[PDB]
């Protein structure tokens, strides 16, 4: 890293474990309706 006293890689990164995901499309048509608790085929 351009100086005397260098350190191997992976030692210059902090590796956050924050797991970020994106906007993720919203789901609308699954929950709107009601259920017929069928108990048979």
């Amino acid at each position: 890293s351009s100086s005397v006293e260098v350190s191997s890689e992976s030692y210059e990164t902090i590796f956050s474990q924050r797991i970020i995901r994106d906007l993720q499309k919203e789901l609308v048509v699954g929950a709107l309706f009601e259920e017929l608790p069928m108990s048979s085929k």
């Binding site: 902090i14 956050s16 797991i19 970020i20 994106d22 906007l23 499309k25």
Partner: protein
Amino acid sequence: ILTMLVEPDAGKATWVAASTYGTDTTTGEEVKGALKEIHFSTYKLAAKSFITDETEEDAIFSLLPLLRKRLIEAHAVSIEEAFMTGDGSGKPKGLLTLASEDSAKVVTEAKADGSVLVTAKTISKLRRKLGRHGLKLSKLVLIVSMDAYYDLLEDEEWQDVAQVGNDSVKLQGQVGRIYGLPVVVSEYFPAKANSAEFAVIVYKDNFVMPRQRAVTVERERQAGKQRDAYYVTQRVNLQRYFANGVVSGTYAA
């Protein structure tokens, strides 16, 4: 570098049919995801001023505050410009340059050489490209070029009080809100030309300024040359968590 992990994209689950049911397939297809990674890093920024000891004596006024103001202003000017338009090669890729890469420069009816003007709709229409990264509306910022802002005031559309509200131009003069977006004017967009850019609609939360050092000043009296050098250095970049998020407008070609 700072690496954060990005959760893998969603995987669908098989609609298993009746044939299966007790066949090891009754349980479907494996949903396997890999945690991807995002990497951040930094780019330096710098400046030198030299005040020879002889000059301060030579001239009437001090000249020292100016060197300082200039250097700090230069970092801001450069950062503000870079963040807007950066090659990305050595400088921070910018809102305008990021959009172009993402194929989000939306060529619009607005025209260079007057003629069409940059109306508000032309500016709001840009939101479609943002995608889902768009609907919320309280997490967006609109930066319009000065010429656009001026064109936005003369928009026939926003002046009529029964066209916009007590906020109409006739009546007020400062188009402050366009279609639910706050309007902030900056002049560091590329200058008006065919193509070019008049507005961006960044999705703020996606962008972070990775730091590492902040503006510091180091004076190094260099006797033997009789100068005192102020070297002010700084290291920062503008990176986005995810590829999408900014959409920019361009005057028509």
